[PDB]
């Protein structure tokens, strides 16, 4: 189901996509898996205080 | 909210005491950050007061995990609410669902040593914007007990300090609300007597001439822990009747 | 991990559509035959082929989309032994010899040489780790065609 | 790592001994004044004692300098003070 | 001088198409093999830090004495309101510090267009919403400070005391001097009467509104030229 | 404090916070202040470098030139539980630990 | 800025240790936070294509037809002989196709310096050994050809025909016009009185001979500057 839903909208195909190195700037050898992952920040306990 | 929901993010906020729920349908007249008054038409339909039911929204209060729970109103001006509708958000809720973290652009790739075991690399744009800026609240209790010379007092009269220390402090020793305090500033104006052993023959003479309250007490106030530096959001007010309601109350 | 992943990806050889046995390293007729075949349509570029001069000049050609492999093994065989002599021992990296190196180097060489020898492998270890991009994905987990048959 | 640690280690019979030499050398280095290696090419930035030992000049022995009567390491201390101008407390 | 036929007789036709004071595409062609994405990275490296700027410094509120306060007439708390002022882009011609006067009451979504216009201060995005206001006297006066700098400066390192000398109530906010927010570059194959192996560089620079696109790309080319200029006088 | 990875960081050095050095390394500061124009006497210097000061950032780093420290984890099993590294002023709160270490 | 600390106040002191004319380690420091890769890369991709130069196109041998055969009176093999010429570097003013002849026999190691001095051709690498002659009629005469190109042009897509059209005797050779052979950059931690998080740019230089490592950097820097001067005047 997923793979079929990736060919319906923009933009890359199969998943991975060709990026570019931030340091060099040349063609990034072979595409990479990217997107928007929902992450979460963890609270800071009293122990975290230096 | 995440870019992928299951159908439980909206159930947690509603059922639990996270999102405020109206008691009875009516027409909203005003919407404040601290209160959301609902003018219920118990009588004839008129802008006049009638079934007034005030709803208090917890703004900045200290919790157990030193976190801050807020409730930002959603309903605007003039909006017929129904029994079961949301009036204000919660600690992390957007509208009616749940939103813990955020949604950013992720790119899995071994950068350069940093992301070895369980490490995370984030751009400098994350600090330029308050997207992860959370609110922390620490409680610093200050109790004055009975001294061998007599009960302690809570006043701004505290020697051995600077001008910037007693500047933010009122005429009772307690700092006002909204002070840009920092590491070193006094939060609570508590004093504590010394003792005959700690007294010098020089300050003993003026003790029985210029009054008893001259050089008997010393410096013993609550300051700000080294390292942390924030602002005052809530002060505590207490005054025992048996100790007389001084300039504090 | 991240350190050995960068060096490992470097010293590898890709193989795709190949028919004629291409072993230019050694023979004389093979070097000429598969020399003009590269610009042709038969022999591909991402295959087994080695023909040039030194190691430094090899990377020059691999940059013009002419050569691919046979350069990762050459660039790694000069940069590492650059900050530290004794190349007779410095050649066995691999995956399991990654721990055997820190054992054989100290014995033959000394303590001081090993100190700077660890800094070199470190830098280039994570450097090429991003130059290649070993990103893991869902499609990366290739499912065997013999799976549905066994089940 | 540290410069010529191997060569230093080779310089002594016992590993633990080399540490004692450098430490003692560092001690004198501050108190009496300064060291044997300086003008042409010595360390750069702000730095320390092993750099000397790596060099040939120093001599570390079991009992190199002492006194004829009584065990007095002290004679060494006296001569050093006489010779080295910079003074510590 | 024409000299040899390579790049001298084949200049770079730059067709600029600037719009407002943010997104402004710039064309660059023709370029030789592997020389398009090369310039795209170099300019990008400089247009992320080496470029000074002017953002919000210290914010003042009428009845608010600390960030964690609340006003009567707005559903959004001060803590959130200040954030919308952090990203607020402000451009100044030549002034060290300038205070922007703002005032509005009654019902009506107060946007960045309500800010009093200044002879040297110019708004670029008057569409950015700050907060929603309601009836019952919703007066919200604010004094925005604007200073210059470079890079990111925490609100705990600088700590400014403008309306702190005697009176108190203000709260310091983060300062984002970095103008550029997003810059892309394409290297699509270009064709010419000569050869086919060419790279077309189309850079799409986007500034928050602090520094003009033309002024940004220019200052970057100056600093970058100095970086490669250090490779001359040996020693 | 929390730990992290130090790529560019070598086995010879470590990446410790800067504010933390203001406290623990105070004794080595006093004996270096009377040499410059930061502080006058030892006594009057006990009420300045004892807290949040930015004038000490330089003088302090001049002392951490050749004076390594000892890192340690609570669960100390073998000998490598406490190693020595050259302190390096790094912004933040986390301490940089060498990948190989 | 002079007062405030910056890359301007602290220039990039270049300390070169050029040896002979085949390799030279160039050190440079200190660098700011983000100027340790933009310098070693901006020149890296230019010294591998954009950098002009002249290389060997094809060489003919008397009596020898193939390139993998053998020549009488020669200690080495024609394979290695023509292989070493790939490293042999010479420069030409303005010639499309120039042919350098050489004739020498008897006991005496022939070198690149034995080539007849052309008024429009420079050796630059006289010491470069090509073959070691002995006794038994060690006759060896070749006419090496050098063309003025750019980057790297394979001997399969180019292929000239001085005596290859109808006659036979010429042998194509990989033409590496680009002088710079290999270029790698390393970033290590630097010690500074103030801050400690400073990057260090140290790139080694390799060259065939046409140009020296020192002048190889300045030429790669001036070209990058010319592109920055293109965003100045619009057209």
PDB file of N, CA and C in Angstrom, chain A residues 20 22-26, chain E residues 37 41 45 185-187:
ATOM      1  N   UNK A  20      22.592  16.755  -1.631  1.00  0.00           N
ATOM      2  CA  UNK A  20      23.897  17.353  -1.877  1.00  0.00           C
ATOM      3  C   UNK A  20      24.613  17.632  -0.561  1.00  0.00           C
ATOM      4  N   UNK A  22      26.617  19.380   2.310  1.00  0.00           N
ATOM      5  CA  UNK A  22      26.663  20.750   2.784  1.00  0.00           C
ATOM      6  C   UNK A  22      28.075  21.300   2.822  1.00  0.00           C
ATOM      7  N   UNK A  23      29.049  20.405   2.945  1.00  0.00           N
ATOM      8  CA  UNK A  23      30.451  20.802   3.003  1.00  0.00           C
ATOM      9  C   UNK A  23      31.044  20.955   1.606  1.00  0.00           C
ATOM     10  N   UNK A  24      30.912  19.910   0.794  1.00  0.00           N
ATOM     11  CA  UNK A  24      31.453  19.920  -0.560  1.00  0.00           C
ATOM     12  C   UNK A  24      30.511  20.620  -1.536  1.00  0.00           C
ATOM     13  N   UNK A  25      29.287  20.113  -1.638  1.00  0.00           N
ATOM     14  CA  UNK A  25      28.291  20.701  -2.515  1.00  0.00           C
ATOM     15  C   UNK A  25      28.081  19.913  -3.794  1.00  0.00           C
ATOM     16  N   UNK A  26      28.921  18.908  -4.011  1.00  0.00           N
ATOM     17  CA  UNK A  26      28.830  18.082  -5.210  1.00  0.00           C
ATOM     18  C   UNK A  26      27.666  17.103  -5.116  1.00  0.00           C
TER      19      UNK A  26
ATOM     20  N   UNK E  37      27.564  24.191  -9.379  1.00  0.00           N
ATOM     21  CA  UNK E  37      27.284  23.895  -7.978  1.00  0.00           C
ATOM     22  C   UNK E  37      28.460  24.277  -7.084  1.00  0.00           C
ATOM     23  N   UNK E  41      27.738  26.665  -3.542  1.00  0.00           N
ATOM     24  CA  UNK E  41      28.138  26.312  -2.187  1.00  0.00           C
ATOM     25  C   UNK E  41      28.977  27.404  -1.532  1.00  0.00           C
ATOM     26  N   UNK E  45      27.979  29.370   1.876  1.00  0.00           N
ATOM     27  CA  UNK E  45      28.790  29.296   3.086  1.00  0.00           C
ATOM     28  C   UNK E  45      28.938  30.661   3.749  1.00  0.00           C
ATOM     29  N   UNK E 185      20.192  26.183  -5.304  1.00  0.00           N
ATOM     30  CA  UNK E 185      20.918  26.360  -6.556  1.00  0.00           C
ATOM     31  C   UNK E 185      20.801  25.124  -7.443  1.00  0.00           C
ATOM     32  N   UNK E 186      20.436  25.340  -8.702  1.00  0.00           N
ATOM     33  CA  UNK E 186      20.279  24.247  -9.654  1.00  0.00           C
ATOM     34  C   UNK E 186      21.412  24.235 -10.675  1.00  0.00           C
ATOM     35  N   UNK E 187      21.704  23.060 -11.222  1.00  0.00           N
ATOM     36  CA  UNK E 187      22.782  22.916 -12.195  1.00  0.00           C
ATOM     37  C   UNK E 187      22.318  22.193 -13.456  1.00  0.00           C
TER      38      UNK E 187
END
